[PDB]
Curated annotation (Swiss-Prot), chains A, B:
Lineage of the organism: Eukaryota, Metazoa, Spiralia, Lophotrochozoa, Mollusca
Signal peptide (residue range): none
PANTHER family: BLR2807 PROTEIN, GEO09476P1
Keywords: Cytoplasm, Heme, Iron, Metal-binding, Oxygen transport, Transport
InterPro entries: Globin, Globin-like_OT, Globin-like_sf, Globin/Proto, Mb-like_M
Binding site for heme b: 100
Chief location category: cytoplasm
Subcellular localization, as worded in the UniProt entry: Cytoplasm
Species this chain originates from: Anadara inaequivalvis (Inequivalve ark)
Subunit structure: Homodimer.
Domain Globin residues, every copy: 8-145
The name this protein goes by in its record: Globin-1
Example of a GO cellular component annotation carried by this entry: cytoplasm
Single GO molecular function: oxygen binding
Length: 145, 145
């Protein structure tokens, strides 16, 4: 159950999550766009799922693309603000889960964001330790899918 | 025009939005739910627009309500973090506007949030001045609908 996954995150994991976010979270626009671009380069099989953002090949030049990147970056903020409160975290996750459930975004498909995240983290000098911690947070969302 | 409305966010209004947000921003969950409850009490003809939310009359108790309440509060935060860059502000508003357009929410309906906000602000000791400043920000989204 979602609650089980949320209550999982330990003090160590929660600490590493906030520690890294403090950086990658400082530039949601610059960092958010990078994550989206990376996911499009490594996972070209997900480009059609964003036919709304038009030509994701534009990057920062794409108005729609930027909107999603910036908006997506904020989505993570909400999860990073409800780490000390499983009750709240679950409610927040379940909400965002609805939008993903209607988009036919299976748990496996959602796990595709792990590749890009790890890259964006390494670019800042965040070894796996941090990459693994982020994976745990992502799992919480998959549990609701 | 979105570009026109956003151009109404002078330095004075920008400062007022941040000065107030700092307070109401401290409690997105507590304040978020309050805004929703006040909106459902002052505007009953807007309850059917949240069928998925289930029983709103439940208040904080309702998990679905809190989830959308906390998430909604974050939406405002994103808009405040873009007050510096008009270009980015629009890209964010347009993105959120698309969600209201597909929901059948016209400028009129949306504008139904000015009442609650004004009430929530007063409870914190923020007269009109602040209530009006927020109206300008809300207007930007109203022009994208
Ligand atoms: C860190 C992980 C992720 C976060 C925080 C996230 C967050 C978001 C948010 C906040 C939205 C807007 C929801 C709406 O307004 O309906 C969204 C939309 C969307 N996301 Fe998830 N997402 C993530 C991963 C993914 C992945 C891995 C995929 C696909 C493989 C995906 C596919 C989509 C699509 C297709 C949309 C709709 C875009 C549009 O048409 O506006 N996302 N995402
Ligand atoms: C400050 C003003 C508001 C903000 C920042 C805001 C923000 C949000 C956000 C971020 C969402 C989630 C979008 C998604 O995942 O699709 C949402 C959903 C929604 N909003 Fe707006 N909203 C505002 C005012 C209103 C008003 C006044 C109405 C109706 C009169 C409204 C109707 C809805 C509905 C029906 C949903 C979908 C709820 C659900 O089924 O989960 N919103 N809002």
């Amino acid at each position: 159950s979602v609650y089980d996954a949320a209550a999982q995150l330990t003090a160590d994991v929660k600490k590493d999550l906030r520690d890294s976010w403090k950086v990658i979270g400082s530039d949601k626009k610059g960092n958010g766009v990078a994550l989206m671009t990376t996911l499009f380069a490594d996972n070209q099989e997900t480009i059609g799922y964003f036919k709304r953002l038009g030509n994701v090949s534009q990057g920062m030049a794409n108005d729609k693309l930027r909107g999603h990147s910036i908006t997506l970056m904020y989505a993570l903020q909400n999860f990073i603000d409800q780490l000390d409160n499983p009750d709240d975290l679950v409610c927040v996750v379940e909400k965002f889960a609805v939008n993903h459930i209607t988009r036919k975004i299976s748990a496996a498909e959602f796990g595709k964001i792990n590749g890009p995240i790890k890259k964006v983290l390494a670019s800042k000098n965040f070894g796996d330790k941090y990459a693994n911690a982020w994976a745990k947070l992502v799992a919480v969302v998959q549990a609701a899918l």
